[model samples]
Target: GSSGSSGMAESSDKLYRVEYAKSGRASCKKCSESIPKDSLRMAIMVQSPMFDGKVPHWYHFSCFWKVGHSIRHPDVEVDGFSELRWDDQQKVKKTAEAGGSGPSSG
Candidate 1:
């Protein structure tokens, strides 16, 4: 779900786009696959400002979940970060209106 207000603004200012395997295709940087529009959910994680005020990276919901699960363990705590979870249904509807599949289902 893009905010319709410079979706890539922060990243653009920092010179970053959602990195896909082939240019112009919606794919996750960690996992390569066409992201389904209907299920498109952007998961963001932002660290403290001391880390150069970095903007959160856009992740396909499934990819984000996988990464989080992989990194999450009993003895470690990944803390001090902000996260934004978008609604897949809204994204799907938006993509449908736009006549596209959006991203990936999983």
Candidate 2:
């Protein structure tokens, strides 16, 4: 007999990602300012009622830190983490530990 292997539904794993911005139109979720094009940006994947798939809310690299995002393991949690420069990778890890105090609002 097949063991009861499927109990919980496939929960959409909310994660963060880092990448270069293709356009400046996307505003930072934390700062409410437009993220400049060609600049490095970060975003968190979240469920969206408007779309069937998850949508990533863009953020400035600096803004991402102050948002109180729980990035306990940035290397494992943040997508495109390895694609970043070595210096940046170190910064992300350091920043994650220094941020996130009060609970963030949805």
Candidate 3:
């Protein structure tokens, strides 16, 4: 009953599962910081008009909130985003949106 076209709220489906990061070589698209090798990360599958098909963008688990989630376009569907968690099912913490005067961590 709550369905609409706002592009808000988290998607019910999980597009991908969390995995180990490449660390210094791989960086977070959210914070643009080094994810470090062997760190926790999320494989975000995204679509871009400039590229063919979908592209995978990795981000740190701590860098939780991503800009893609708030996009107005419907093609950018991000599912299973909020479901990221540890082995025991402890989920990651959500940070304040970017460009906000709130604290951020990695």
Candidate 4:
């Protein structure tokens, strides 16, 4: 359905994580496209009123940067901006560091 939804709250408890897609159903919220099987995807945690806790929205890692969106929360961390392949992790960090719209490795 939705690609990404990294929201902020009054506190600094936002969570970020990257995981491989188990299905091709979810698409990038930014690009509005489908992700292939087993592709690495990312998403940030948001406080969901429906669940009374935090919920995650999957994002296409590449599409995220394509949207040129930035992680505004200084305290925000994508698994502490670690994990994933070094290059991909670097891409994520670079994108986040520049608030998106940064240089692409390719």
- TM per candidate comes to 0.30, 0.69, 0.48, 0.54
| Candidate with the greatest TM-score versus the true structure | 2
Question: Per-residue lDDT tens digits of candidate 2, residues 1-106?
Answer: 8777766763435378787788879987787888889987888887788797888888777777666665888786887777888988897788788774334579
lDDT computed for candidate 2: 0.77
Number of the top-ranking candidate, with lDDT as the measure: 2
Model 4 vs. true fold: TM: 0.54
How accurate locally is residue 61 in candidate 3, as Cα lDDT from 0 to 100? Answer: 59
Model 4 Cα lDDT, one tens digit per residue, 1-106: 8898888564434466676778888766677788888887777666777899877766777666565546643234555344466676656656666765546678
Best of the two (1, 3) by lDDT: 3
- The alpha-carbon deviation from the true structure for residue 95 of candidate 3, after best TM-score superposition, in angstroms, is 9.3
Residue pairs clashing in model 2 are none
Ranking by lDDT: 2, 4, 3, 1
lDDT of 1 by residue, 1-106 (tens): 8767644533223221222223334555457766665443443455646777755555564465455433322111222112212343344334334443335578
In model 1, the runs with Cα more than 4 Å from the true position are: 1-27, 32-38, 48-51, 69-106
Model 4, global lDDT:
0.65
Q: For candidate 2, what is the TM-score?
A: 0.69
Model 4: residues >4 Å from true position, as ranges? Answer: 1-14, 27-33, 62-76, 102-106
Listed per candidate, the RMSD to the true structure in angstroms reads: 13.5, 10.2, 11.8, 8.1
Question: Model 2 clash tally?
Answer: 0
